[PDB]
Amino acid sequence: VKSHYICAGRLVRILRGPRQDRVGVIVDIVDANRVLVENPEDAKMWRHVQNLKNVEPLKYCVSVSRNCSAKALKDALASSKALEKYAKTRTAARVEAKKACAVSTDFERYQLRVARRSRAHWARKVFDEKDAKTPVSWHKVALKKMLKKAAKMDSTEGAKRRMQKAIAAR
C-alpha cells in the first residue's frame, strides 16, 4: 500500500520541536498517541517519549524486539546499514541543504546567486540551438508557417521590381 507502518524498529524523523529534522528508532509503543524513541548515533537522541503527531515514518525498519537493550539496538543498526542507505536519498540531501542555507553569510549568498545565473545563461544557449533546428518556441513556430506562404508570392515579378527599387532607394 506504499505507506510505512508504525512498528518496533521503524525509523522515523522528528517534525517539530527542539529535536526537529533528526532521526530515531522506535523501541516500544505506549498507546495510540505515544511511542518511545532512541538513537545511539546522535548525542541528543537518548531514550524518550514522542507524540505520534510529531513523527514521519521512513522506509527502513531494523529487526529488534520491544523494549530492547541499548547494546542490542546498536548492533542491529550497524548490521542493517539503514543510516548509510538513508543518507544517500534526495530528501536527506534536501534537509542538509536547508541547514546550510540558514547559516550562510552574505558572501556565500552572492556565490550562490552567481552559480544560478551561470546555469540559466547556459540553458538559454543550449535551448537556442535545438530551437533553430527543430522549431518549438512561439516565434520560431510562426516563422515556419509564415515563410512557406510568404515566399511563394514574394517571387512575383512586380514584388521583385518593387523590392529592387526600394532596396536601391535606400
Binding site: 540558514a102 550562510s104 553569510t105 552574505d106 558572501f107 549568498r109 552572492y110 556565490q111 552567481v114
Partner: protein, 148 residues
C-alpha cells in the same frame, strides 16, 4: 583612555578597518564598499569602495547607516595616514565633476593601493565581483533571519 582624548572610541567590533560594508542610506544606497578608518574623537567612518568598481569615492559615513559583514580584506599595506578631517573640511562661502587636485591625487593613491591589496588577497576575483554586486530587498525576503 580618557573620554577627552582623541583616541577614545566606542565603535562596535564588527566595523573593523578592512571589512566590507553595505550602505543603507544616501546617494550610494545599496552599494558595497570597504571600511578604511574612523576619524578621531569618535567620529564617522571613511569608505572608498573603491571607485573603479562601484563608483563610490572616498566618503564619510556614520556607523549606524552601514551593515558590516564578516568578509574582510587585509588592508595593512595601504597606509591610510593622509586621510584626516582637514581634507573633509570645506571653506565657508558668504554673501552669494569639480574635484580638487589634492583630493584627486589622494583618491588615485588610495585606490591603487586598495586594488593591489584586493588582487593580492586570495579569492580576489570573487571579492571583486562581490564589490561590484548590488544589494536590494526582494519580495519574500526576511533579512531579520539572515546571518551576515
Amino acid at each position: 583612555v580618557s573620554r577627552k582624548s582623541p583616541e577614545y572610541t566606542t565603535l562596535r567590533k564588527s566595523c573593523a578597518p578592512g571589512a566590507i560594508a553595505i550602505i543603507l542610506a544616501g546617494r550610494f544606497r545599496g552599494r558595497r564598499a570597504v571600511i578604511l578608518k574612523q576619524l578621531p574623537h569618535n567620529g564617522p567612518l571613511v569608505v572608498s569602495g573603491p571607485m573603479k568598481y562601484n563608483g563610490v569615492p572616498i566618503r564619510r559615513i556614520d556607523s549606524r547607516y552601514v551593515i558590516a559583514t564578516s568578509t574582510t580584506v587585509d588592508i595593512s599595506s595601504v597606509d591610510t595616514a593622509p586621510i584626516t578631517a582637514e581634507v573633509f573640511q570645506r571653506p565657508k562661502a558668504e554673501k552669494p565633476t569639480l574635484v580638487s587636485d589634492a583630493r584627486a591625487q589622494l583618491q588615485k593613491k588610495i585606490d591603487a593601493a586598495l586594488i593591489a591589496a584586493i588582487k593580492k588577497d586570495a579569492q580576489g576575483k570573487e571579492k571583486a565581483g562581490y564589490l561590484r554586486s548590488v544589494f536590494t530587498v526582494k519580495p519574500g525576503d526576511a533579512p531579520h533571519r539572515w546571518n551576515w
